Design a protein around this ligand. Sequence first.
Ligand SMILES: Nc1nc(O)c2c(Cc3ccc(C(=O)N[C@@H](CCC(=O)O)C(=O)O)cc3)c[nH]c2n1
Ligand SMILES: Nc1nc(O)c2c(Cc3ccc(C(=O)N[C@@H](CCC(=O)O)C(=O)O)cc3)c[nH]c2n1
Ligand SMILES: O=c1ccn([C@H]2C[C@H](O)[C@@H](COP(=O)(O)O)O2)c(=O)[nH]1
Ligand SMILES: O=c1ccn([C@H]2C[C@H](O)[C@@H](COP(=O)(O)O)O2)c(=O)[nH]1
Lengths: 285, 285
Amino acid sequence: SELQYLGQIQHILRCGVRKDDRTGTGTLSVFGMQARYSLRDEFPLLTTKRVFWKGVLEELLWFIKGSTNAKELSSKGVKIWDANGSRDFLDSLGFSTREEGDLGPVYGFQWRHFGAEYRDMESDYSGQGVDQLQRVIDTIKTNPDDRRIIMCAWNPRDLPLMALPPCHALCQFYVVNSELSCQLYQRSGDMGLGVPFNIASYALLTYMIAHITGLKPGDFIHTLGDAHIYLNHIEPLKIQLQREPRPFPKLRILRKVEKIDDFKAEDFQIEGYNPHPTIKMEMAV
Amino acid sequence: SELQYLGQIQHILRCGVRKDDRTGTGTLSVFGMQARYSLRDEFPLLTTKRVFWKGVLEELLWFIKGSTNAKELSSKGVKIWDANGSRDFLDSLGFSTREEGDLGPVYGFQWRHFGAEYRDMESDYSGQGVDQLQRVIDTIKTNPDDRRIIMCAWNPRDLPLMALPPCHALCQFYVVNSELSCQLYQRSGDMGLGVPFNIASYALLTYMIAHITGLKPGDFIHTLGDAHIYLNHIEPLKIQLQREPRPFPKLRILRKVEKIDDFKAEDFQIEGYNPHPTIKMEMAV
Ligand SMILES: Nc1nc(O)c2c(Cc3ccc(C(=O)N[C@@H](CCC(=O)O)C(=O)O)cc3)c[nH]c2n1
Ligand SMILES: Nc1nc(O)c2c(Cc3ccc(C(=O)N[C@@H](CCC(=O)O)C(=O)O)cc3)c[nH]c2n1
Ligand SMILES: O=c1ccn([C@H]2C[C@H](O)[C@@H](COP(=O)(O)O)O2)c(=O)[nH]1
Ligand SMILES: O=c1ccn([C@H]2C[C@H](O)[C@@H](COP(=O)(O)O)O2)c(=O)[nH]1
């Protein structure tokens, strides 16, 4: 339920410790958290504040396509990766010869081409690397009892080439009683911005795979490493914490899709989403 | 084979007529020309001057992508369409409300969405209009004897909205004895600047389609309408006419590609290209 996220917010504000970070703003940090969100007949889209649903959907399709180019996501009206792909950010990391928008071997590259040699965002990687996403789907179809259905985005070899190392670094799938469940290990959680995106993102991915594999969505287990609240998010989150949460919406898939690459943005519809007003929170770059 | 291009240059300088034009610089003009460039075991990339092959390749991928945004091609390091997409140029055509880089319904829009109503360069046109490029490839696969395999970019209805109406306006494909040939009708030919680009551009496109349909490249027939030499190109072309042509290079495709949209710039490799020094020639805007 949504009260778990609000309970995590309240715990960090009350029991978190001051901690510096890569950005300039400090954080209130707590290490080690877990929450369980039901995917059964509902979709975990937060109601205590309006969540950018098109950003969640377009970013996930952008992941599935294997793209590491922020221009392709920004052309869909979703600018969440424009900052980490800007010219100044890439220059601050030493990527002086890299084209703007090239985030490096990140989520999209590691999901579909783990092990391939990364050249640039415009290179052809077809046939190179491990296709973790498809092997996950095939293992679910052929062996639901397998305890190794894992898609890992943390590539220690490719870390120096990434503009931002993967925050949701590893996820595992689990099948029992015709239910598909998903657990995600998030090494770093921006509780105000990224965490609501990531919870809705991997719930959507579980809905996609369950739709293809003929399973029913079960639980989404959100495991956090450094769950932190930025200082410039303390007052906005204190406002969100005073809002009464409303029932979760529902996710309807409008057509029968066979391959995860065939999913289009027009195939999904969120029903019954009545959130509180949107709360603007700045990104720490 | 290259001697045909040089013969046309020499023919325009010797028998061309003085003619004004839309730009400021005059021209030496000749109406009605034809040349045949063999694509068998060679690629017609001119040797009497170094041709910007990266510009030729990136522009075609930009055409296939259906883009009409000069900014998207310019971000690849190819500024050949930046002039006709500038703010001052669009204002001189009355396009005071157009965004910069929006060339209007041009090659990329007409190849993939012929008949759709053009909004702007960033609008989604997927599913709208006639996909001439794909219908060409499908017709070749299913009926090579068809005499209607044509991709036409000249749309009289969309002409007032174009920053520059298509110069290579119509192309036709032809299959016999498992050989794919292509003819281009170019209504207007900048013999010094655009024509060497256009010849290599449509030769590369024929290599792409033959690779997709499993055919061998045959001939490229270059038909010119208003073949003109700009005044500020007379001395540069007189220098090029003194250089001995060298054997054509070869074009190798590095992987088996199934759909023409999957082609990336890394999949192509020019081998044996030993051109004469580069000859700078200004563009007439
Ligand atoms: N410190 C930090 N925190 C993050 O959450 C991220 C992300 C992922 C992400 C997730 C959401 C947003 C975001 O700006 N969301 C907006 C939606 C509207 C918008 O895109 O402007 C919001 O809810 O206020 C931006 C980035 C990528 N990089 C991040 N760096
Ligand atoms: N008068 C006129 N002539 C043209 O050739 C065009 C074009 C297509 C085109 C083709 C090639 C170039 C061009 O600058 N080519 C250069 C490459 C190096 C460069 O970027 O200057 C060359 O081969 O010398 C520029 C524009 C678009 N608009 C044009 N208008
Ligand atoms: O999907 C994402 C992307 C980014 N972040 C946040 C977590 C951090 O606040 C910041 C990245 O900082 P590093 O931990 O890499 O220093 O981005 C997320 O929570 N989820
Ligand atoms: O692929 C191309 C694009 C442009 N041009 C040149 C021909 C003309 O010199 C100019 C277009 O001007 P108008 O013909 O519309 O005046 O561009 C070419 O030769 N090939």
